[PDB]
Each structure stands twice: as structure tokens, then as C-alpha cells.
Amino acid sequence: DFDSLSGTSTTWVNELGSVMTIDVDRKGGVTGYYVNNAPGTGCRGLPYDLSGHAHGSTIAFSVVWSNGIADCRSATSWAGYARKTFGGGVQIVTQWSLAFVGKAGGKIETGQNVFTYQAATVSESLLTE
Amino acid sequence: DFDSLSGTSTTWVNELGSVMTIDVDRKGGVTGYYVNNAPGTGCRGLPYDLSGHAHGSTIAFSVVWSNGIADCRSATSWAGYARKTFGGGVQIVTQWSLAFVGKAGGKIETGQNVFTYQAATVSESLLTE
Amino acid sequence: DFDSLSGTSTTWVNELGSVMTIDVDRKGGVTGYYVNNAPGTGCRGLPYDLSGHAHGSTIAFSVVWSNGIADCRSATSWAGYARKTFGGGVQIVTQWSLAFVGKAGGKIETGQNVFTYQAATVSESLLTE
Amino acid sequence: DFDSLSGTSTTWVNELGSVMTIDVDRKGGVTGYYVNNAPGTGCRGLPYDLSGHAHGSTIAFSVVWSNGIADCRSATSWAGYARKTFGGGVQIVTQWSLAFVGKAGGKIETGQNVFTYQAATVSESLLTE
Amino acid sequence: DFDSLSGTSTTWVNELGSVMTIDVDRKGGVTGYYVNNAPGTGCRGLPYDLSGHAHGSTIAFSVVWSNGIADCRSATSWAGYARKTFGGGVQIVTQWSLAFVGKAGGKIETGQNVFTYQAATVSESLLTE
Amino acid sequence: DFDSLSGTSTTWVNELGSVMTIDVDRKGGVTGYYVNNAPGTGCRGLPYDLSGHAHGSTIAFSVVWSNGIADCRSATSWAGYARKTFGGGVQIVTQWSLAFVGKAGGKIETGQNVFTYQAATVSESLLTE
Amino acid sequence: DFDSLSGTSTTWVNELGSVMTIDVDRKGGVTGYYVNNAPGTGCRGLPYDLSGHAHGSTIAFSVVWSNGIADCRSATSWAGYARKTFGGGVQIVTQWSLAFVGKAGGKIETGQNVFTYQAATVSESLLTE
Amino acid sequence: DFDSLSGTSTTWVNELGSVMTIDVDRKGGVTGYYVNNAPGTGCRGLPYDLSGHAHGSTIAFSVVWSNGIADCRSATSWAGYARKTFGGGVQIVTQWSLAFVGKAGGKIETGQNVFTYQAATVSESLLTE
Amino acid sequence: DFDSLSGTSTTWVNELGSVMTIDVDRKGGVTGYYVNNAPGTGCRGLPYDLSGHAHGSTIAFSVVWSNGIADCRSATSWAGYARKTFGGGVQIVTQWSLAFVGKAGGKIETGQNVFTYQAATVSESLLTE
Amino acid sequence: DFDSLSGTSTTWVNELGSVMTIDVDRKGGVTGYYVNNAPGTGCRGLPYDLSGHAHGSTIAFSVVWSNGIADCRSATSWAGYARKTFGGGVQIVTQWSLAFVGKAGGKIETGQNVFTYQAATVSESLLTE
């Protein structure tokens, strides 16, 4: 249930190391940012604005790949559902669609990502875990 | 082409007669509503909130299927590119993803829609075209 | 009795399957939208703004048939009374007036509509009720 | 054209001496007041809130008959079209519906009223024309 | 005590049928409207802006006779005191001054008007008491 | 003519040496203060709020004699006309009404005041003109 | 004692009948007006803007002798302490400095004023104490 | 002329090294801070809020000696005039009054300060002029 | 010179591949974020808020290593100067200090970083650079 | 721990007698000012704006040595940790870096400062401590 994230900020990591941090407001409005870490892609390593909406067990969100720093002239959107995992964990199973303009005109690709909730961590220092 | 929708409201209809009306602000922020007319689906015939972002020839938007009237407990997201058609027409080619929870657990489906720009119509009367 | 709708959003369907969603504020101000399904009319299947006022058992509201998508160069106004249905349901019994300007010039029609309150619904998924 | 009334206040009088003073904003939103002077009615001689909408040659507006002074537990709505008269006068041709609840139960009447635009006047003093 | 009228709207009628509807705020600020029904005067039957101030048992208020509809090129001001009548009625006993400019030059008349509080009424319908 | 006072602050003295400073806004709204010097009156030598309206050659304003320092349980209202003085000066010829509640109860007096416009002055120092 | 003037307006009069009305906010910010009644001085009889600050038993305030009506091209500032007098009265003992430009060039004078708190008075009428 | 400081920030130093930095707005409102460096005084070396008013050649301002850091339970006010000095300089000649509460009750002292305008300086580094 | 950065957003990379994006306001206020890439450090790959100030040829900014995702219980501050590179480029030569608390209590380390200005880039797609 | 400083304003002095006053917000945002006392430095005795961040046991803050009065073309940043003193006191142990531009170009110096928390004080008067 994404309604229990109402007024929280949570971070989620997919199988390729890409990260999203999402703020879900009381109406289920989703804001935050996405850091792309996917091998073979541009617009890696810096925050891109993310927005969408969540209700019950389902969520949809999109990122346009332009942040004033690197513009990949592309758009991704995700939809997914929450599922609980063995001994207290939580994930979002998603399908994405990516749109862009190749030399050969428009193209669109799709794929799955599973995003795993990452609890906030505390280390001893910047130098030592 | 999507930057030149700056400060405009535009309507687009897909192959199944589903309608989206979108407001695109100067920063490429997308708001408006979607009306689902897709045979075999719930949440038909009434505006649902739509949001996302447009930048180049690309756009990404989401709808959560809850409006206070009918809740299908599902979420759709689209990513698309603009193309002109012979005629001086404009279409958005899109791929979508749909997430929901069956009795079987969560599932996701994908598909294409092409949305065609519909220019504003004027009739003689409510009774006569 | 409409004072009890203060701060609420309620959906109503008429004998033609036309649907409105009205918001009644603390002072009896009515806003919301109307989706027309009347056979042999234009301006069907999309929201049009509505406004009026309600006090006690009576209500009056108006729709101008222009929403930036389809202009039928017409306006409808309704006046009605609330009546409890056997059980705990509620209807609005209305008389409407329709004004338009055709090739024959200005005309006015009248008729009755009975609106029935429809509580919110929840389905399993967008595909399965 | 009620579009030409954008940013204007205009006063209109019907064949029974009843008056409407309306403000049309740049989106066609109608606000103002109605003064009922119809022989044999209540709620006479004093302003009631009026709201509605105008576009092109058509207008619709509503008055609930409660202003904190006299409550006739009724609602009127009007739909009309503009017509030009010889002399450069302008009229709103309307059909109205009036809803009320007698000890009889709910009732609705209908009727026509033509509203004639009244140009602003300047008199010598409060005591002489 | 006009202090007891804090946050209230009240309507008062004088011996010629003229009406004032006033709002007294918590600092004694008076706003509202005046409807002139005096035989043999202009600026009749429609609201003019009224402003002034009330404290304890005294009140003063002004109407300029220009409302964008009829301009009688005149100004009235009133000063008065409250008095209770047998039955729990309340009256404002006023002296007024009226200034205007005839082809004669400037002129000022004076007079008395007693304003009687009119309690809010509820009638069966617009058509019957 | 008072429309030409739009956006101005102007000071005026009467035959008793009472002074008012009025601010007339674009719509003819009058605000400011009144300093009373009338012999044999209380509430002398300190500002009291004033409000009213001016249009064309006429004006009406009011002072309630309570300013949190001295309450004389009274209200004065003025109505008057502007008249140009030989040269380029200007006066307001007013009739006032005064209402108060004494040990004999409610009373109303009337009289005339003529206000003369006084332009701003500059001295050398607080000690030497 | 000056902290307990928090959210109050208070009037004080000096030995020469000069008056200051001061508003003290929760932070000790002082606003209001001063009326000069000092024999031998210009800018007499009308409010001038006063500001400064109060904290303990101490206060400091300033008046610039320009109000849009009479400009004496001078500035006074006061510093003072509160003291109670036998009676349950309250005074502010002050020292002032006055700056101006004579034909001789700039000069500054100093002096004491004691200001006495005047409680709000109520009279029977404007005519009768 | 302090009117030529309208919307500037300027710094001034007196014979004892005390500093004031004042912002004069378009109406002659004075805000900023004072740093006390006077031998034999508390509340030295840190900013205290200053406010007052300037017009033509004269200025008045006050400082209360409480900043949340050191409270000397004292108030100073200044009045002065501007004068030009040999080869382009500018000063403010002031008289101050200081109020405080000694063991022996309230006391007040006065004296002169001349404040000299200090032009903004630029050094090579924090280490070298 | 960093005053040429007024109203700009600029991205900078150091010799370790750490990147900051800084917003310099018209007053030289610096905000933005830092993404850490230093070998053997925690808090890597995600934005941390940064703030400081810039004027002429010098800048100073700080990061606390807590962003709600990974808290390394540390703080870094930089001071630096602007160095123009052969051919229109720009570098910030900085000294940093890192404060943290280990098992043996508080520690501080220091070192040098050189930041290079990186203009925005545009790729063909998210897939091809 | 600096999170106990949320919503507080606190003054701190170092071994050279330099003083800062810092405002820590509920999010650990630091603002305030620094007054420099270091021997052989310019920009002494007057406030310079300071900003940075604090969380848990660490803080980082910066000052640019330009305040409109004295520009030393330099910037200092500090990083430090909180150290509880025997008996309820608190110190910030800091390392600073100073960047400036001399005749031989950019230079950076570094060193240590220990800040001690100084609670607010109250003197009897500005004259006696």
C-alpha cells in the first residue's frame, strides 16, 4: 500500500543500480527524482525530475531525460505494483516504456525493472562504514 | 514539436476512441485529463487526472484509475513521440504499461496506442452539425 | 436536501445516461462538470463546466456547450427539486431549457430530466470488476 | 455576441419590470444579481445572487431565491439567446424553469421572458431628470 | 447597540419603502447597499453602495447616487441612533442631507427617515406565502 | 469636481477651524481623518476616522466620535457639493447631521459647514516659518 | 512595564498638551502618531508618524516633521523611562533632541518632556461631558 | 540631503568608532543596525537594530540595547542634520539621549556625536591592505 | 569572476569525478547539490544539498553528508578561487576540510580539489550519445 | 549534537575573540553572521553573512568577506565537530580554509579555530555591567 507512504520520502533501487526517491503526498501525488545507472545509456549519475501518482498497490511515474545538464531527448514512463518480500522487505515491480528519436525516426522500447526499498543507512564517517 | 504546445490545451484520441486533453506549460509540465473508452475496461466515460512531462518530440504521462467516482485500483503510464502524418496532421505514437492486482497477485500488460490531434470543432447547435 | 451536500462531490445520472459531478460548497455554490449522452446531440462524451446554486430542496445549474474541444453554440439550464427514493436513494427532478442559434436563427426547447445519485464504486482491476 | 460584454456590467429588464445586472468576465463567467418585480410573487424588490455562463449568442444563469432576507425555497434557471432590435437595442430571449416544494410536493413551472438592455442614464439631480 | 450587529447582515425599511441592507464588522465598519423607492426621485429600485460606521447606539452612512446604471449626480448622508420599540423591534432614527447641483447651482436638502429592522422571512414557494 | 482627486490626499478646513484630510481612490471611495475644533464639543484636537464616497461635484462622509481615546457616543454625517472659488480655490458646501444619546435619550442636530481646500505648506524649521 | 503594552494602543500627553498615541507589538516595535501642541512651533494640531522601540522600562521614538500637510524640515527623537506616580498613574520621563537648518546652518536643541498616560474617556454626547 | 540615499545602504562612523549602517527607502524610512564601540559602555561590538526616518537634511533614529545576545535595558535616540565637509565628504551632526534604570531609579543623559560617511573599501586580501 | 554567474545554474567536476551543480543568485548566494565519487568514501552517487557564497574571484561552500538516504555523520566545507584556463575555460581551485566523529572522537582531514566547469550536453537519444 | 539547536539563535566565540551568531532551522540549515577579530586581518568588527549546514555532531559554514562596507576579496569556510565540555558546555572544533587572490595569484591558507557557546547576558544599564 502506497497510501502508507503519505507525507514520507522513500528510496528504491532497481536491478541495474538506478535509484528513485519519491515523496507521496496525502492525495497520492508522486514527486522526487531519478538517478539513471543503466549500462549503455546517457543521462547517467545525476538527478532527473520524476512525477506521477500512487493509489493502493499501484503507481505510475515518468521521467523526461532533460535536467539542464544532459538532455537525452527521451522520455520514460513506468507503471507497477507493490509486493512484500521474505522477512519484512518491499519492492515495486514495474514495466517501462522509453520513447526517443533515432536517425530512423521515432522508436519505443519496453522492459521490466524491480525496485527494492532501501532503508536509510548511517555510517561511522564519510571514510569508514 | 511539443515545446510549441507551450501555454495551449490540445485534445488527442486513440484508435479505441479514448481521449486525452493536455495542458503543456512553458517548462514542459503536462496536466489535464484522460477519458477511457476502451472495450472490456472499467473506469469508462469520465475524466481521470493525467500528468507528466513533454520535451522534445517525446512525452511521458500517467493516469491512476481513481477519480472519486470509479476506482479500478490500476495505473497506466505512456511514453510517446510526436510524428506528422501526410495531411498536415499530428499524432503521438505511444507505448503504455498497466499495473493492477488480480486475485492471482500483481500483473502488468503493455500495448501501443496512437493518439491523433483533434482540432476544435464548431457545430450549428447541440441538435445540428 | 442539498445543504447536507455542503463540502461534498456527488455524481448523478439521468434517464438518457448523461452524468454530472457536482461540488456544493458551504454557501450552496454548485460547480463541477456535465457529460452529455443525449441521442442526436453533439458535444457528447466529454466534460463541460457546470455552475449554479442549491438551497434546501431546490437547485438550478447551467452548462454552456463550449469546452475548447466542441462548441455546439448552445446553453442548457436546469431547475429542480430533490426527492428521496423509497429506501435511502435521492433523485433530482428537473425541467431544462436549451437555447441555440441555427441557420433558422434563435430557438429554445424544454423538457424534463430525472437525475439519480450514484455512490462511488471500486472494481478489482481496470479489466475485471 | 456576449463575448463583447467581457469586463462589462450590463443591466437588462423583462416585460414584468424584473432586472438582472450581470458581469461577464473574459472566460464568459456570469455573476451579478437579479431583482424580482413580478406581480403575485415573493422575494420582491431586492437583489438575489445570479450566476451562469455566456458564449457567442447564448447564455444560461440561475437564481436561488434565498438571500438572507426572504427565502421563497425555490430556484429559477434561464437559458437564452441574444437578438439585436431596430435602433441598436439588444435583448436576451429566455426560457426559464422554476422549481419549488409546496405541501403538494415538488413542482416545476416554465415560461418565457425577453430581457431588454437598459443603457446607463445621467439625470440632473435625485429630484429631477 | 450596533456592537451586537458584529458579523451580521440586517435589512431596514423606512416609511417610503426604501431599504438598506448593512454588514457591521467587528470594528463597527458598515458596508452594504441602499435601494431607493421614494416617490418622485430617480435612482429607484436598484442597489447603490452604502458605507459608514456604527458604535454603541449611533451610526452614520453615505450613498452616492451613481452605480453604473443610473447617476442622479447627488450624495446622501445619514446620522442616526438606534431605538427599541414595543414587541422587541428596533429602529434607526436618522437625519439625512442630500447634495446635488441643478442648473440653479449647488443645493442641499435635509429630512428625517425612521428605518425599521425587517426580520428574515421564509415562504412556502416563490408563488405562495 | 472630485473625480480629479482620484489617487490624492487633500486637507480642508471649515469655518470653525475643524480640519479633515481625505484620500479619494479611483472608484470615488473616501477615507482619512477628521480633527474637530467646534467650540463646546468633546472629542477635540485628535484624529477620528472618516469614510464616504465622492462622484462628480458631490460628496458624503461620516465620522463616528470614538477613536479609542475619547468616545462622545455620537456620529456626524456630511453631504456636500464642490464649488470653485474666484481664482482657483475650491470649497465644499456641506449640511451635517449629528446623532447622539444623552440622559434625555436620542437626539439629532443639523447645521452647515463650508470646507476650504488648504494646499501643503513648508516652513524653514519647527521654530521659524 | 513596556512589555505589558504588548498588542495595546495607549495615549500619553506632555506638560505642553502635545499628544502621542503608540502601538507596541509583541517584539517591542512602536508605531503610532504624535500631535504637537507646543507654543512657538510649526506643524501643530495634526498627526505626524511616530516610530521606535520599547523594551524594559525604556523607550526610544522619533518623529520627522513632514506629513504631506505641513513640513517643518526638522526631526525630533526621544529616549525615556517609565515610572509609576502615587495614584496608580504611569508616566514616561523623556529627553528629546530636535534638528533643523536655520539660515545660520544646522542646529540641535534638547529638553525634557514628561508624558502622562491618559485612560480612554467616555462622554454623554459630543455636546455634553 | 538624505532623500538622495533613497534605496541605498550607507555606513557612518562617529568620533568613538561606533558604526551605523542605514538603508533609506523611497519614503525616507530608516532601517539597519548600530555597532556600539563607546569606551565605558556595555552592548559593544555586535549589531543592534536601528530604525527612524529622514527627510531633507534631518534624520532621527533610535536603538534599543537588546539584540537577544546582550541586553543593557537602555534606549538611545538621535536627531541630526547632514553637512558637507572640505573636498567632497559628508557627516551627520547628532544629539542623543540615553535612558536607563540605575539603582537610583530612571536616569537620562545626552551628548553630541558626529558620524562621518565611510565609502565602501576594497583590500587586496583578508591578510593585506 | 563568479559575479558573471549571477542568475545561472552551472555544473563542475573535480579530479575524482565528483560533480556539483550550483545556483548563484544576484547577491552571490550559492545553493545546489554535490554528488560524491571519492574512492573509499560512503555517501557516493546521490545528491547532497550544498550552500555557500561567491563574490569576485572567491567562493566558499559546504555539504553535510546527510540527505535522508545515507548519513555519513560528516561535513565538508571548501574555500576556493576562480582560475581562468588558457582559452575561455574556468576552474575553482579549492581547499576542503572534512569533520567527522570516529571511535577515538572528532577528527578533521584536509586536502585540495580542482573543479572544472562543464557546459550542458545534448545526446541523440538515451541509447546513442 | 546540533539537532538540539533546531529553532535556536546561538552566539559562539573563538580563541581570537571572533564571534558568530547562528540560526539553525528544523532542517539543520545554518544562517547568521560572523564578526572577525583576527590580528593582522581586514574586514574586522562588522557582521558578514554566514551560511552552512549542521547535523548530529558536525557543522560546515562559510563567509565571503564582502558585506558592502569592506570587501577583502576572500572567502573562509569551516568544517567542525561538536565537543561537550566538562559540566554542560559546548565547543565546535573547526578547521578553516581561507582563499584569496594576491599579486602572485590565488592562495589558500588553513588553520584551526575552537568556538565556545556564550549564553545571552543582561546588564543593569549601558553604563554599568
User: A48 to chain B: nearest residue by CA?
Assistant: B53
Taking the Cβ of residue B76 and every Cβ of chain A, the question of whether any pair is shorter than 8 Å is answered with yes
DSSP conformation class of B120: P
CA–CA separation, D3 and D26 (whole Å): 8
Q: What is D9-67 written as a DSSP string?
A: EEEEE-TTS-EEEEEE-TT-EEEEEEE---TT-SS-SSEEEEEEEEETTEEEEEEEEES
F129 burial type by CB count under 10 A (0-12 exposed, 13-18 middle, 19+ buried): exposed
Taking the Cβ of residue A21 and every Cβ of chain I, the question of whether any pair is shorter than 8 Å is answered with yes
Q: Does the beta-carbon distance from F102 to G125 stay under 8 Å? A: yes
The residue written with cell numbers 476650504 in the block is F116
DSSP conformation class of B3: G
Q: How does strand I121-122 pair with strand A70-71?
A: parallel
Please list every residue in chain G whose beta carbon sits closer than 8 Å to the beta carbon of residue H61.
Answer: 62, 77
Q: How does strand F8-13 pair with strand E70-85?
A: unpaired
Please list every residue in chain G whose beta carbon sits closer than 8 Å to the beta carbon of residue F121.
Answer: 69-71
Distances (CA, A) of G25 to G22, H50, H72: 10, 16, 20
Length of chain A as a residue count: 129
CA–CA separation, A110 and B110 (whole Å): 8
CA–CA separation, J11 and J6 (whole Å): 14
Q: How does strand A58-64 pair with strand A70-71?
A: unpaired
Measure I96 CA to nearest chain J CA, in Å: 7
Q: Does the beta-carbon distance from A49 to B51 stay under 8 Å? A: no
Note whether I touches J: 3 CB pairs or more under 8 A.
yes
Give the sign of the dihedral formed by CA B23, CA B29, CA B35, CA B38: positive
Q: Which of B69, B73, B74 sits opposite C120 (nearest CB)?
A: B69
Cβ contact I67:A47 at 8 Å: no
User: H96 to chain G: nearest residue by CA?
Assistant: G97
CA–CA separation, J100 and D56 (whole Å): 69
- Cβ atoms within 10 A of the Cβ of B111, count? 13
| Residue F103 C-beta-side C-alpha neighbours within 13 Å | 4
CA–CA separation, I38 and A85 (whole Å): 33
Length of chain D as a residue count: 129
Measure I96 CA to nearest chain A CA, in Å: 14
Distances (CA, A) of I43 to B20, D83, I36, I47: 42, 73, 7, 9
Cβ contact B121:C66 at 8 Å: no
* 3-state DSSP assignment of residue E127: coil
Length of chain F as a residue count: 129
Cell of F34: 477628521
Q: Does the beta-carbon distance from F123 to G98 stay under 8 Å? A: no
Tell me, rounded to whole angstroms, the distance of Cα G116 from its chain centroid: 10
φ, ψ for residue C92, nearest 5 deg: -115, 120
User: D119 to chain E: nearest residue by CA?
Assistant: E69
- Cα-atom radius of gyration of chain A, to the nearest Å? 16
Give the sign of the dihedral formed by CA H27, CA H29, CA H31, CA H34: positive
User: Quick one: residue G72, left, alpha or beta (phi over 0 = left, psi -120 to 50 = alpha)?
Assistant: alpha
The residue written with cell numbers 551627520 in the block is H92
A window 89-118, beta carbon within 8 A of I: 98, 100-103, 109, 118
E window 43-62, beta carbon within 8 A of D: 43, 45-47
| Residue closest to C22 by CA, chosen among C38, C5, C40 | C5
* 3-state DSSP assignment of residue F5: helix
Resolution in A: 2.1
Taking the Cβ of residue C82 and every Cβ of chain B, the question of whether any pair is shorter than 8 Å is answered with no
Q: How many helices and strands, by DSSP H and E, does chain I display?
A: 0, 10
Taking the Cβ of residue F77 and every Cβ of chain G, the question of whether any pair is shorter than 8 Å is answered with no
Q: How does strand I47-55 pair with strand I58-64?
A: antiparallel
* 3-state DSSP assignment of residue E108: strand
Q: Does the beta-carbon distance from E123 to D40 stay under 8 Å? A: no
Q: Does the beta-carbon distance from E69 to D120 stay under 8 Å? A: yes
Q: Does the beta-carbon distance from H81 to G100 stay under 8 Å? A: yes
Please list every residue in chain E whose beta carbon sits closer than 8 Å to the beta carbon of residue F112.
Answer: 108
CA–CA separation, I112 and H102 (whole Å): 57
Cβ contact G126:F72 at 8 Å: yes
Distances (CA, A) of F80 to E32, F11, F74, F92, F93: 22, 16, 20, 6, 5
Cβ contact F76:F97 at 8 Å: yes
Cell of C106: 434563435
CA–CA separation, A29 and A25 (whole Å): 5
Cell of D116: 431588454
| Residue C66 C-beta-side C-alpha neighbours within 13 Å | 21
Q: Does the beta-carbon distance from B42 to C11 stay under 8 Å? A: no
Cβ contact B95:B107 at 8 Å: no
Please list every residue in chain H whose beta carbon sits closer than 8 Å to the beta carbon of residue G76.
Answer: 60, 79
Task: Name the neighbours of A, counting chains with at least 3 Cβ pairs within 8 A.
Answer: B, I
| Residue closest to G35 by CA, chosen among G115, G105, G129, G99 | G115
Q: Which residues contact H58 (CB under 8 A, 6 or more apart)?
A: G64, G73, G74, G75, G99, G100, G101, H2, H79, H80, H81, H82
Read off the amino acid at residue I68: G
G9 burial type by CB count under 10 A (0-12 exposed, 13-18 middle, 19+ buried): middle
Could you tell me the maximum CA-CA distance found in chain B, to the nearest angstrom?
A: 52
Q: Which of C49, C77, C79 sits opposite D108 (nearest CB)?
A: C79
CA–CA separation, D104 and D101 (whole Å): 7
Q: In chain E, which ranges are E strands?
A: 8-13, 19-24, 29-35, 47-55, 58-66, 70-85, 89-102, 105-118, 121-122
Distances (CA, A) of C90 to B129, C8, C85: 35, 15, 5
CA–CA separation, B24 and B8 (whole Å): 6
Buried b (16+ CB within 10 A) or exposed e, G76-103: bbbbbbbbeeeeeebbbbbbbbbbbbee
Q: Does the beta-carbon distance from F54 to E71 stay under 8 Å? A: no
Measure B48 CA to nearest chain A CA, in Å: 12
CA torsion, ordered H117, H120, H123, H127, to nearest 10 deg: 70
| Residue closest to I45 by CA, chosen among A41, A21, G86 | A21
Please list every residue in chain J whose beta carbon sits closer than 8 Å to the beta carbon of residue I80.
Answer: 75, 99, 108
Determined by which method? X-ray
Q: In H25-88, which ranges are E strands?
A: 29-35, 47-55, 58-64, 70-71, 74-85
Cβ contact H79:H95 at 8 Å: yes
Distances (CA, A) of G96 to A106, E7, G44, G108, H95: 81, 45, 17, 10, 9
- Cα-atom radius of gyration of chain D, to the nearest Å? 16
Length of chain J as a residue count: 129
Cell of I40: 573509499
Q: What is I104-115 written as a DSSP string?
A: TEEEEEEEEEEE
Please list every residue in chain B whose beta carbon sits closer than 8 Å to the beta carbon of residue A110.
Answer: 95, 97, 110
DSSP conformation class of B108: E
Cβ contact E120:D71 at 8 Å: yes
DSSP conformation class of G119: P
Q: In chain H, where are the structural domains located? A: 1-129
Element (H, E) at H13: strand H8-14
CA–CA separation, J61 and J12 (whole Å): 13
Taking the Cβ of residue I129 and every Cβ of chain A, the question of whether any pair is shorter than 8 Å is answered with yes
